[PDB]
Design a protein around this ligand. Structure first.
Ligand SMILES: COc1cccc([C@@H]2N=C(c3ccc(OC)cc3OC(C)C)N(C(=O)N3CCNC(=O)C3)[C@@H]2c2ccc(Cl)cc2)c1
Length: 89
């Protein structure tokens, strides 16, 4: 209810697969369900949780690659800006 916008359609399918329902979502509203999705699907390595391997996911089939490290916010913001539709650049 923060006058927020809609994400990319495969992101909305990943949110539905997490058990959610929606149209408009913030990065925080996405993340609540995306952390839950990655945990229930196990899209991470138990020993290196600082990486997620979405290149094998719908996020990967959309972007051609979506495997990344969570410790590096700059390339992560560049990916987010393509998967959650917004301003910038
Ligand atoms: C700005 O938007 C973000 C984008 C990417 C990452 C983050 C955040 N970084 C981590 C996280 C960080 C470190 C880590 O391990 C060292 C594990 C993490 O969780 C993933 C494995 C799900 N995320 C988590 O969900 N967490 C971190 C906090 N505690 C948890 O149990 C789960 C967030 C996340 C992950 C993926 C997405 Cl698509 C969205 C949100 C925010």
């Amino acid at each position: 209810q923060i006058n927020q916008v809609r994400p990319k359609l495969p992101l909305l399918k990943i949110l539905h697969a997490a058990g959610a329902q929606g149209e408009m979502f913030t990065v925080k509203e996405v993340m609540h369900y995306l952390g839950q999705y990655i945990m229930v699907k196990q899209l991470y390595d138990q020993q290196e949780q600082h990486m997620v391997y979405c290149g094998g996911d719908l996020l990967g089939e959309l972007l051609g690659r979506q495997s990344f490290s969570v410790k590096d916010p700059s390339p992560l913001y560049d990916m987010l800006r393509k998967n959650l539709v917004t301003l910038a650049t």
